[model samples]
Target chain A: AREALELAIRGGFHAYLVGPPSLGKHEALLAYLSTQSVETPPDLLYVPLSERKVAVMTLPSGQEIHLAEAVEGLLLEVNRLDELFRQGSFLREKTQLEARFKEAREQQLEALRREAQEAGFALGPVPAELSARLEEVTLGSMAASAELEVALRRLRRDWALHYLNNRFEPLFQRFPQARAYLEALRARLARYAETGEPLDPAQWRPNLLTSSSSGTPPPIVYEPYATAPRLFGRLDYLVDRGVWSTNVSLIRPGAVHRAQGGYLILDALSLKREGTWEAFKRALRNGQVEPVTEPQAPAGLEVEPFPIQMQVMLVGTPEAFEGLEEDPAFSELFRIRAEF
Target chain B: AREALELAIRGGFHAYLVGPPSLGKHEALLAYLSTQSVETPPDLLYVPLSERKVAVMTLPSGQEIHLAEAVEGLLLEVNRLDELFRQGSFLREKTQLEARFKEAREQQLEALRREAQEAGFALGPVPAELSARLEEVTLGSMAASAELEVALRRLRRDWALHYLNNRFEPLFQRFPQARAYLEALRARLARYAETGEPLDPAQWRPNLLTSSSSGTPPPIVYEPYATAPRLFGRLDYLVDRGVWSTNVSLIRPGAVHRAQGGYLILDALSLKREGTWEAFKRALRNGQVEPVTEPQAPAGLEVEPFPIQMQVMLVGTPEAFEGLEEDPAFSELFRIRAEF
Candidate 1:
C-alpha cells in the first residue's frame, strides 16, 4: 500500500482508496500527503477584461495576488488626473489656446469692419443688408475657428490620455506578463478620456482563482459539497441597482481549479449527484474546467477554461469503486487502486 | 421671493420655502441655482483609521474619487511584495545570512567533536550521555544561530517595508493634502509587512460623501427621506458571512454633507418625524453633524463629525413652518422665509 501511494504521487496516477467512512481513510491520506514533498502549483487567476470576456492565466506561485495589487496601484495612479489637468503647464497651454482663438476671431472681425468702412458702409448700427454682407465675409473664418475649438478639445483629451498612460509605464515594465491586460486597460482609458465613460474599477481587479505563497507546498483541496458548479467553478451574480450583473471579479474558482498542480480529494459517494460525475470526468479527460452556470443563471455568460494538472484521490467503500468500475473509463482514470 | 432667495444664498441663512409638494418649488430652486454662479464645494471623504475611528476630511472639489483611486493604487503596489522579497539582492542577502549561521554552527560542532575525542570519547557514535554533553557544548552557538535566524526574518521584513515605502514616495509627492492619511497607511503597511496581517482593501477606500467634477457648480442635495441617519449620514452595517461589520467604506453621507457650500433641500414634513428636526437644528446651530445611529444599530460605531457650510431649504405648505414657528429657534434658523 505504501509503494502504491508512491506510484500514485510520482507516477501521476489517480487513486481510489477503498475504505469505510468510519475508518478515517481521508484523514490518513491527508497525513501522508503532508509528509511527502511535491512541487507547488502555479497560481491561477481570471482577469476579466470586459463583461463577457475573462482572461485565464497562470503566474508563478503567489504571483497572482502580487499582479493584482500592481494593477490596482496602476489604476489608482491613473485615475487621479485632477492634478494633472490642474498643472500650470497644461493650464497654460489651454489658456493660451483660448486666447489665440479669441484674438484670431477679433482680428478677423476688425478686418471685416475696416473693409466695410472702406466700401462706404458705416459698421456701427449697420442696416440688416450690410450686417448680412459682414456675416458672409466672416463666415469662413468663423467655421475655421469652430473647427479649431473642436481640435483643441480633442488635444486636451489626448493630453489626459497621455498622462494616464505614462502612469501605467512602470507597472507595465514590472509585469510584462500582463502586457495584454495592461494594453487593453490603456485602450479602455483612451475611450474614457475621449468619451468621459467611466471605467469600472472592479473590472480592473484580478479575479484570483487560487494562490500559494512562495515555498509553500502544493495545495490539497478537500471538497465537502459535490455540485458541478461547486466542483468546477461558477460565475456569481450581483443585483446592483436592480440590474442583474456579473463581472470578472465575481468569477469564482472551485475545488478542481484550486487544486491545480496538486491533489484534489473527493468522496466517491458525491459523484452520484447530478452533473457532478460528468463534470469530474470531463475535467479529467479534457485537463481543464470552465465555470459552470447554475440553473437560474442568466444566459450568454461564459469564461475561458482553466487547465489543471493534479492527482485526484477518491475515498469510499469497496462498493463505491465496484459501482464506478462499471463505467468504461473508471479503471483507466483511477489506475492506482489501494485498500486502506 | 427672488430677494428672499438672494438673502438666503448670500447671507448664510436657511430658508423655509412655503409651497405644495407638486408645485415644483424644488425644481424652481434647482433652475435658479443652475443659472447662478456659486463657489464649488470641497469634496468630502471619510478615511477609516480603524474599526471604531473614521477620519473625516475634505479635499479640493472633484478630488475625493481621485484620492481614493490613488490610495487603492498604492495599496495594490504595496500588497504585491512577492517580487520585492524574491529580488536577487534580497534573496542573496538572506542566503548569505543563512549560510553564515550554518557555517558557524558547523564550526562549533566540529570543535566540540574534537574536544570530546581528546577527552577519550569516540564522538563518532554519540551515546546519549555524550550527545547531551555535545548539546551543552554547542548550546551558546546554537542559541546565537537561532537569534540570527530571528534577526534575519526581521531584516527581511524591514526590507519589504523599505521597498513598499519607496513605491509610495511618488504618491506622497502627488497628494500633499492626504499626508496624514498616507502616513497612517504607511504605519499600517509597516505592521502588515512585519506581522503578515492582511489588509482589508476596503478600509483604505476613501468614503466619498460627495464629489463635484472640476468646473461644476456646488452640489444641491434634495433628501426625500429625512431620518436623522439618512438625512445627516450614518455608519452602514454589513452582515458579511455571519458577522455584522461596519467600516469606513460604509460611512455614508447625508443631504447636509452632500450640499456643502451649496443648498440642501428637504421636505419639511420629514423634519417633524422622530429625531430629524433635532439633528437638522443641531447642524444649523453647530455648523457640523455626527452620524446618527439607528434604533437597531450596534453600539460603539462612531465617526468624526463633518462640518457643513450650506444653506438648507425646507419646502412645504405654509402650515409646516406655522406649526414650527411656536419654537423660537425655528425662526432663528430659517431667517430667510419665502412663499414659493
Candidate 2:
C-alpha cells in the first residue's frame, strides 16, 4: 500500500484502495498524507476588477487578511479628505489665488471708478451700466473672477494627484504585488474627485475564497457525497427576507478546493450519483475546479475556475468499485488500485 | 485731533475728518491705527450644514490651515481602507463567521448524505428533491446560510462603526472645538458604509471666507472706491468657459472684512456714490457686513452675513462731508469729527 501510494505520487495518479470495506484503507491514506511533505497552498481572493467584474487571485499564505485590512484602513484617509483640501500647500495656494484675484479685480474696478468720476458722472443714484467706464469695470471683474476660477480648478486637480500619490506610496511599498489593484483604486478616487460623485466601497471589498496558515501543509479534504455542487463547489443564490442577492463571497468552495495541493479521501460508493463520477474525473484531468453556476446568473457574476493540484484516494470494497472499473475515464483518473 | 480720535474710540464713534484735502488725514489715521492695540480676529469658514445649507463658523486665529491640513491627511487613511477590512479585528470576525457558516452547512449536509445512502435508494441518477430527508436537508442548509448572511451584515455594521470611531478619536482630540463637525462626519460615513453609497466630499469641503495669521493685530483697510460691492463685499458669480458657478469661497471680502477689529480708512469723496455711504453706515450700526447677493441666486446660494467690529476713519475735506452732515443716521454713526 505504501509503495502504491509513492507510485501514485510519482505517476501523478489517484489511489484506488479495494478488496474490502472498513479494512483501514482510509486510516492508512490519512497517515500517509500526514507524513508527505507538501507545500502550502496560496490563499484565494476575489477582488473587484470593475463595477461589473470580479477577478480571482492568489497570494502568499496568511497575507489575505493583511491586504483586506490595509484596504479597509483607506476609508480613514477618504473621510479625512475634507481636511486635506482645507490645509497644507493646497490651502496656501488656494488662499493666495483668492487674494490675488481680489487684488487684481479691486485695482481694475478702482481705476474704472476714478475714470467715471472724472467724466462728470456722479456714479450715484443710478446703475453702473449707465457709465461706459463703470460697465468696463464690471466686465473686467467678471473676466478676472472667471480666470481665477479656472486656475482654481487646475490647482485642485494638481493637488488631488499630489495627495493621492503621496498617500499611495506606502501602500505600493508594502504590497508591490498589488500594484494593479492600487492603481485602479487611485484612478477611481480621482474620478470621484473630478466628478464630485461618491465612490462605492463595495467594489473595493475583498472576498476571501480560501486561505491556509503560513506553516500548514496543503489541505486534506474528505468528500463523502459526490453531488456536483458538494464536490466542485456552488454559487449559492440566497434570498434573504425576499431580497435576492449574490456576490463572489457567496461562491462556496467544496472538497476539491479544500484538497488542492494535498489529498482528497472519498468513498467510491458516493460517486455512483449521476454525473458525479464524470465531473470528478474532469476536475482531476483539467487540474482545476470549475464550480457550478446558476443558469439565471448574469455573465460577469460567474466566478472563474482556479487551478488545483491534489491526489485523490478512493477507498472501497471491490464490489463498490465494480461499475467504475468498466469506465475508461475512471481508469485514467485512478490508474493504481491497491488491494487492502 | 488726537484727543478727538481717542474720544471717538471711547464712545464707539467712527471718525469723520473735517478739514481741507491733502492735510495728511489718511496717513494720520493709518499711523493711529498702527499704534492702537487690537486683538486678532477669528478666521471665518463656511462649511456645509446639509446638502443645500452652509453654516458660517469662526475658529481661533491660524487654526483654519491647521484644521484643513489635518483633514487632508485623512485621505492617507481612507486609501488604506482595503487593508483595514482585510486585517485586524474586522478580518478575524468576518473570517470566523465564514468558517462557522461553512462548518455548520457541511455537517448538516454530510448527515443527510449518510442518511440517504443508508436508505434503499441508490441516491444516484436522480435529483435529491425526490427524497423527503434530502429535501429537509436542502431546506435546513438554506436556513443556515441565511442565518450566516444576517449575522455577517450585523458584524459588518458593528465593525464599520468600530473603525469609524477608532479613526475619529484622534481628530476629535486634535480639534475638540470641532466636535459637532466631527460627529456629523462620523454619522455621514456610517450612512455611506451602511448603504454602500459613496459620500460627497464636496459637502465636506471647507470654504475659508477670511483668515488672519497668528500674532497679527486686526487689519487696517483703506477703501479708495466706495462702490456697494467694494465697500461691503459681494458674492461674485463667475462664468468659467460657460460653466456658471459660485460658492462661499467666491464671497469676496470688502474693506469692512479686511479691517475687522481695527480701522477702515475711506476717502469720503468716494461716498458720494448712491447707497455707498448709507450701506457703510448700516454695516457700522449693525456691527456686521451684509454681503451683496445676486437676486438671481437660489435661496441657499446666498452667503450668510458675518459680524464685524472695526473703527471707520473717513478722511476727506469739509466740502466732501457736506452730504453726510445732514443725514439723521450720520450723526449717530460718527459722533466725533477730527480737524486735520
Candidate 3:
C-alpha cells in the first residue's frame, strides 16, 4: 500500500502483478513500463543466438552473455550447497569407502598426502607405514561427526579457492570468446569473498557485453504460452544435423524467461499446463529459467538453470492467484499482488 | 478383497500400503519383500562417467548413456509427446515463420528443393528460369498444410534420423570409453522404432558398472527427515572452481532418488515439509524430481529433474491414505493403497 511498486522497483526483489482476467492487466503493466521510474531499468534480453535448442541473451546493461552464464549467476550460493554433501553420513560413508577399497587406494593416498601437506603435517610416524598412515588419517578424521564436518568444510573451501585461482574453467568452458567477461565476473566474486561488502570496482559491469552502455537496457517482452516447451524450453532433434540441442535461445523462452528484467503478462486462463505452471512459479521463486524434461520424452535435455530479475503480472480469474497463495513460495514472491 | 497384494503384484499397477504410524508398516513391507516372488529384478544404475559438473550413466545392459536414456527408456511414449509440439496453431506458426524469416529461409527452401528434385519435378512449368523453378515448386508445394507438415515431418524425421545417424553427441559427450555400450542401446532404440516393441533382452540386463552386476542392488532404505537436503539433493558451489555445480548424485539423493529401483520407508510424522510433500507428489506425477527453492529466495541453480523407478512404503497414521484419492495423479500412479 505504501511504497508497493516503488519499493519493488528499487530492486530488493522480484514481484507478481495479480489482477482479474481480461481486466487490462497489460495496460497497467504498460503504464508501469512507461511511467514507473527505475533506479536502473534492467537490460533488455534480445535474441543473441538460437538454434534448435538454446538461446543467447543480453543483460540490462547490454552484456551479451550466454544464458547459461546466468545459471551460475550467483556462484556464492553453490558454496553453501557444497557443505551439505560433507554434513552427515555422506562424509562418513565416502571416507569408509575410500579407506578400504583397492580401487580407491591411489586416490585415497593422494588425498592423504595432499591434505597432510596442506595442513603442514608430516606422515610416516614410526610404526605407521605409508599405507597405514593414509588409512589412519582418512578414517580418523571422519570418525567424529563434528571433526568430519570441519574436515570436509576445509576441503571444500580449498576446492573453492582452487576454482577461483584458476579461471573458473569448469564454469567457463562454454564461453570461449568471453575470457575478458569471465575475468571480470571472477574478480568480483573473489573480492566479495575476501571483503564482506561486494566490491563496487571489482565488479562484472554489465556494459562490457551489452550492446548499449547508456540508460536502462530494453526489456524482453514475452507473450503467454500455455505449454511447457513454449513457456519453459524444449529439446529439438535437428533432423539435418542429427543432434539434440537446446540453448537458451534455440529453446523458446517462456514468459518468465522472456520477462527477465522487465515485465511479464499472463492470462490465468492460459496458465494451465501442469509442467509450465510449476516452472513459471519456479522461475518466479528462483528468478531463473530452467528446463526439466520427462525421462523418455523427446530428446530431453538437462540444461543449466539461470537467474532473472524482473516483474510479472498475472491477469486472470482470481481463482488462479487463489491456488498460488497456498504455495508458500508464491506468497513470498508475490508481495504486491494489487487486486483489480 | 481376496487377492490383497496380489492385485498390485499382478501389475495392472503399483501398490501403496497404508496404515497408522508405528504400526509396523516396515514389518509388513519386510514381510512383503520376503514373500514376494519377483519374475525379474530391475538392473541397478551405476556410474558411467564423471569428470566435472556432470555425470553420465547407463541402464543395466551396459547402455553407456544418459540416465535420461532411461527417461526415454519409455520412448514409445515419446511418439505421443511429439504430436503435442506440432499439434496445431503452434506448428502452423512455425512453418510459416520458416517460410518468411531469412533466419529460417535457407533451411526451409533447401527442404522444398530436395523434395521436388527427388520427385523429379524439373525446374518448373515449361522451364524458363532453372533456379526459380526449383525454388518455386519447392516453396509452392510446402505452402499447403499437408505438404508443409509432411516436409516438416520429413525434416524432423531427418532431424531424428540425423540425430540417430550421427549419434546424438550430447547424450554421449561425457562418456569417453563406452564404445560397446552406446551401440547396444542405440540398436535397441532403432529396433523399437522399427518394430514397435520394447524388446526385452533378458529383462533389464544390468550394466557392469552397477554395484552388483551379478545380482540385484540392495534396496536403499530411507527414513524421514524434517529438514531435507539429506533426502533431497542440495545445490553445490564449487568454490575452488569459482563455479556452481549440481548433479543428482552430488546432490544428496533424497528418499526418492536413493529409492530408485528399490524401496523407501517413511513415517508420515516426518513428512511435514509442506513444500517437500507437494514436490513428492509432483515427482510421482511427472516421473521426475526437481529442486524448487524456498519461496522468494535468491536464484540458485535449477538442477536437472531426474527420473526414478522406486517402490515407496509409507508408515503414516493410516489416516493419510484417505486424502490421497482426491489427487488424480496419485490415484493413477499408486493404485494399490491397501490398508491393513
Instruction: Find the candidate with the highest TM-score and give its number.
Output: 1
| Superposition error at B173 for model 3 (Å) | 16
Computed on C-alphas against the true complex, the DockQ of each candidate is 0.01, 0.01, 0.01
Candidate 1 residues B1-340, lDDT tens each? 7888888877768888887657667788887876666766677778867656778777877777777877776676543554345433456567878888888777766776675453553443446466676667567776977788687768766766665565566657767777778878877776666566788887766777666734245567787678887777776778767777777877777776777777788878767855678667777788778886656755455677788777788888877667678888898888888866
Q: Per-residue lDDT of A61-115 in model 2, one digit per residue for the tens?
A: 7777888898787645555555667777778878876887777666655665564
Candidate 1 local lDDT, A149-228, one digit each (tens): 68666866788778866767886777777778877776766656556567678766777776673324557878656888
CAPRI class assigned to model 3: incorrect
What does each candidate score in C-alpha RMSD?
25.4, 21.3, 25.4
Name the runs in model 1 displaced over 4 angstroms.
Answer: A1-340, B20-22, B50-52, B78-80, B103-150, B213-216, B294-302
* Chain B TM-score by candidate, in order shown: 0.82, 0.71, 0.45
lDDT of 3 by residue, B176-272 (tens): 3443444455554554443446534322232222232221433545475634554554543332211122333333345555555555666555655
Each candidate's fnat: 0.00, 0.00, 0.00
**lDDT of each residue in A182-269, candidate 3, tens digit only:** 5555555544443334433211223121233232443535455567665564434332232222332334445445555465566555
Residue B300 in model 3: lDDT: 28
